Design a protein around this nucleic acid. Structure first.
Ligand SMILES: [Zn+2]
Lengths: 43, 388, 109, 325
DNA sequence: AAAAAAAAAAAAAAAAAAAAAAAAAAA
DNA sequence: TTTTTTTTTTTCTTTTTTTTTTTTTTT
């Protein structure tokens, strides 16, 4: 899933015209979580 | 254009959206009746004709405007015909018991696939669709009239009921020995219209539908109260002891817990007339438990930010080899009680049985106490008029 | 503390209406004596919108990420008195949200 | 025949209340001349709403107000105050129905109704609530608790009810003690959600929320709130936690009620006395500050009606612990 | 003691309607 | 910094748009 709640740390996702809060606490700040990508670095 | 993205609107075509989803609620009762009550599949294609024949008269309306008399009682009305036209022995007693126990879908408008129909305009249509009533004084007996007055019946379908099994069903509900079927069997041969299979009522397109009480099963049950009046007031051989009149009357007043008796109890709840008051004040520890066990499995079919306060109240404070005997083991037990079978005071023992069995059929048939007496007294004159 | 002592030494500011009473017109009018009687600062609590659906506590680690203040509610107990103390009306008001110094006796930490 | 926890049919009674309040408006208004919706609001703009109680108790040892006046009533004059407001009502008495027409003749003759609006609605949802709220009160009086817990758990799920049964499960989990968390936790759940800190002055024909037994926080505390302080006070008593309650009371400064100040005094008074049984030098200075607290809040407590046991048994206890230390 | 032309009886979900308030908006 | 629109409750009330069965009058 996309996002993560701040207060209770439960994964969730949102849609268009959907409320921006968690569904177990109603906290109003969501961290966009990290997915799998291919960033290249030089060691 | 975005203002019409928010709430969808329909004009004159709402009556078809009313009627297309009317076919959807029709189908759910049909597929239920063939599954839990194992009805035949060709019975459906009767109803697929039957629903179409009324609907053709709907598209035969001379005005484009609506004015169309439609109800949820009409839904069970057309399901009554195809059960009697195919001669399945179900009656108007069972349809009350099958909608007032929430076995089949009657009261719900939420099972309509509401993401395409109840979004549009349910404004007053779900006031018809949500079953916000019980049929008070036999509205179904007027609702079989308006469906015969829209679709003809004397030449299309067979207008008869298996009234020898209706008379079988009436005996085993109470505690009578089977000779009382045969005593009644000649009375429905004697005074019923030059012996005939009992017909459905006729096509009455008056808005008051008379005062005549020519309904079919009302003629059957009013006949039953005449015989038990007459077979007990004229038992000249002393074949029926005064202890025997007691032992049946005490056997009816005992309450046993079975799915027939529990299914009787729920229609005492929706009952508008007294004695519905003390019908829920004198139960057992047991009888309310299967009232709640019915509730926690058949009010899960209820009618559908703040969920978080709700899901916390029901979280911490939650709702947490058969002892319930069958339909025969009590009926065998209730028959073995009245084995004492092998004098102006017996009128009081007869007069007390005449009210128990009259309150019984009043409840189980959704019929007023007034209209039972008008039906039975016009019958009472017209059974003495053929003999005296 | 110094806040109830602060409003004790403000005084009572008095305005008059001037109705003559229709009775040497020593009647100046009616003595409106308005004064503040008690000040209290509430800890940070927030209601998510309206209706006091549960007023949770507000910790400051929330208040940094939102990029907004860390307020507590300020409540004046106004006294509205008439005619040198005849008719007094004690109404608490909601006079804004003032900020609150962290780790003090008005912070949740 | 108990009370049903929902609001009812609004078809004829809302019209029946309008015909009743229009006739009481005119036969008042003819009477106040000769004794020298809007008709509903004219009734309630007059007097009051009793918010913190059902009825309005007042003082007897006060002003006199004796009406020995005349006995001021003839059948001649009263039937003249009756006559034209009857004629004023016959002109709108044609729109109400015959059953409504029959009702107004009964109350103008001085008669009272007999059938209540609960017993005549006949809805499928309503008739299943009514048989449950009467089965609830029946088995609670009989102490059929494990059955009555099953009644309450299914009544709160039905989509029409509101929780006008705060005391039913407020008292049920005190008696069950099988699985569920006790009545402190349900009472916590009420004070979070039903604070309602708005000071909404009356102005409104109220019909869905009658009582003072579930309101709060306009000028009067919630009834379920102060039973949460009292139930927490008895709960910490059964150790011999008291810090957790005493911080919880100080977070509201509720500067109007003195019932909460008596609980605030009572939770220091328990702390000052269980800290002497554990005693028998810093453990003696902490006793005195609790007594200096209690002696201040009892003097705060003299702003309204008397929450003094006497005013002496509060302190006759207090000096008995000072004789110890 | 049974066939008829005038209406009323209900009913229930959605849009609205005064009261009050939160409390920025902006020039 | 003055009025302040802009908005939001907030419970109580009306709208909508049909359906079900009346009553007295003759035969
Ligand atoms: Zn969350």
């Amino acid at each position: 899933l996309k996002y993560i709640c701040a207060e209770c740390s439960s994964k969730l996702s949102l849609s268009r015209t959907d409320a921006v809060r968690c569904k177990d606490c109603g906290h109003r700040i969501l961290l966009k979580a990290r997915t799998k990508r291919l960033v290249q670095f030089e060691a | 254009q975005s203002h019409k993205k928010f709430k969808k609107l329909i004009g004159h075509e709402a009556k078809l959206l009313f009627l297309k989803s009317f076919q959807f609620i029709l189908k759910r009762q049909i597929r239920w009746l063939i599954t839990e009550m194992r009805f035949p599949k060709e019975f459906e294609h009767v109803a697929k004709i039957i629903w179409l024949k009324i609907l053709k008269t709907i598209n035969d309306q001379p005005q484009e405007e609506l004015k169309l008399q439609l109800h949820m009682t009409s839904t069970i009305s057309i399901l009554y015909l195809a059960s009697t036209h195919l001669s399945l022995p179900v009656y108007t007693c069972d349809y009350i018991k099958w909608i007032c126990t929430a076995k089949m879908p009657y009261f719900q408008a939420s099972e309509i696939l509401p993401k395409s129909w109840r979004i549009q305009l349910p404004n007053y249509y779900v006031s018809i669709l949500e079953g916000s009533i019980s049929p008070f004084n036999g509205q179904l007996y007027n609702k079989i009239a308006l469906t015969c007055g829209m679709i003809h019946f004397k030449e299309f379908f067979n207008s008869e009921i298996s009234c020898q099994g209706l008379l079988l069903k009436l005996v085993m509900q109470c505690a009578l020995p089977p000779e009382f079927y045969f005593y009644t069997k000649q009375v429905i041969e004697f005074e019923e219209t030059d012996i005939r299979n009992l017909t459905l009522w006729e096509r009455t397109d008056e808005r008051h539908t008379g005062r005549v009480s020519n309904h079919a099963e009302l003629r059957v049950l009013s006949y039953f109260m005449l015989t038990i009046n007459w077979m007990l007031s004229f038992d000249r051989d002393r074949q029926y002891p005064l202890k025997w009149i007691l032992s049946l009357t005490e056997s009816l007043t005992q309450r046993t817990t079975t799915s027939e008796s529990i299914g009787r109890n729920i229609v005492k709840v929706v009952y508008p007339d007294k004695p519905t008051s003390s019908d829920y004040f004198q139960w057992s520890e047991e009888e309310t438990l299967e009232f709640l066990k019915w509730m926690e499995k058949q009010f899960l079919p209820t009618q559908t930010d703040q969920k978080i306060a709700r899901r916390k109240l029901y979280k911490i404070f939650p709702l947490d080899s058969t002892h319930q005997l069958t339909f025969i083991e009590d009926l065998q037990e209730r028959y073995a009680k009245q084995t004492p079978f092998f004098p102006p005071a017996r009128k009081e023992a007869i007069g007390r049985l005449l009210t128990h069995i009259a309150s019984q059929l009043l409840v189980d048939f959704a019929i007023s106490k007034e209209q039972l007496k008008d039906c039975i007294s016009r019958i009472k004159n017209a059974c003495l008029h053929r003999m005296n | 503390g110094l806040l109830n002592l602060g409003v004790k030494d403000i005084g009572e500011k008095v305005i008059f209406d001037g109705k003559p009473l229709n009775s040497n017109s020593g009647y100046l009018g009616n003595k409106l004596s308005v004064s503040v009687e008690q000040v209290s600062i509430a800890k940070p609590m927030s209601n998510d919108g309206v209706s006091s659906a549960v007023e949770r506590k507000v910790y400051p680690s929330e208040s940094r990420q939102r990029l907004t203040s860390y307020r507590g509610k300020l409540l004046l107990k106004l006294k509205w008195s008439v005619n040198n103390g005849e008719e007094n009306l004690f109404e608490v008001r909601d006079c804004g949200g003032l900020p609150v110094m962290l780790q003090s006796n008005r912070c949740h930490l | 025949m108990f009370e049903v926890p929902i609001t009812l049919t609004n078809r004829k009674f809302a019209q029946r209340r309008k015909l009743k309040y229009q006739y009481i408006n005119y036969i008042s208004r003819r009477f106040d001349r000769i004794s020298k919706s809007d008709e509903e609001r004219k009734f309630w703009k007059k007097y009051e709403k009793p918010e913190k109680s059902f009825e309005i108790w007042r003082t007897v040892s006060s002003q006199n107000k004796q009406p020995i006046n005349k006995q001021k009533m003839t059948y001649h004059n009263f039937k003249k105050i009756e006559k034209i407001p009857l004629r004023k009502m016959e002109i709108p008495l044609l729109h109400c129905t015959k059953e409504n027409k029959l009702y107004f003749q009964s109350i103008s003759r001085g008669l009272e109704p007999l059938k209540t609006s609960t017993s005549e609605v006949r809805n499928y949802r309503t008739r299943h609530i009514v048989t449950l709220t009467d089965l609830l009160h029946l088995n609670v009086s009989r102490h059929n608790w494990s059955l009555a817990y099953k009644i309450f758990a299914t009544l709160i799920r039905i989509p029409g009810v509101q929780i006008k049964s705060l005391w039913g499960i407020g008292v049920e989990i005190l008696d069950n003690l099988s699985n569920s968390s006790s009545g402190l936790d349900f009472l916590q759940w009420m004070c979070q959600i039903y604070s309602s800190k708005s000071r909404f002055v009356q102005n409104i024909n109220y019909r869905s929320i009658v009582p003072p037994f579930q309101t709060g926080s306009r000028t009067h505390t919630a009834k379920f709130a102060i039973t949460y302080l009292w139930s927490s006070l008895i709960n910490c008593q059964k150790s011999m936690l008291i810090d957790k309650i005493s911080e919880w009371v100080l977070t509201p400064p509720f500067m109007e009620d003195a019932e909460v100040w008596f609980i605030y005094a009572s939770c220091h008074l328990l702390k000052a006395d269980t800290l002497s049984r554990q005693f028998v030098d810093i453990k003696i200075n902490q006793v005195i500050k609790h007594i200096h607290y209690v002696r201040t809040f009892l003097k705060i407590c003299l702003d309204k009606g008397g929450f003094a046991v006497p005013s002496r048994l509060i302190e006759n206890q207090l000096k008995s612990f000072e004789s110890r230390l």
